Amino acid sequence: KLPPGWEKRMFANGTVYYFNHITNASQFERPSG
């Protein structure tokens, strides 16, 4: 689904984002869109 090292995440308010476990980077929008 996601590009290398990326996975789906979510804030405690119910808002969804993307996070990279290899580099600790994050985006609100889909990585390599």
Ligand X SMILES: *[C@H]1O[C@@H](CO)[C@@H](O)[C@H](O)[C@H]1O
Contact residues toward ligand X (CB under 6 A) are 11, 13, 15
Report the distance separating Cα 1 and Cα 5, nearest Å: 11
Q: Which is nearer to ligand X, 11 or 22 (CB)?
A: 11
Report the distance separating Cα 31 and Cα 12, nearest Å: 21
Report the distance separating Cα 9 and Cα 13, nearest Å: 12
Nearest approach in angstroms of CB 12 to ligand X is: 8
Q: Which is nearer to ligand X, 15 or 32 (CB)?
A: 15
Nearest approach in angstroms of CB 28 to ligand X is: 7
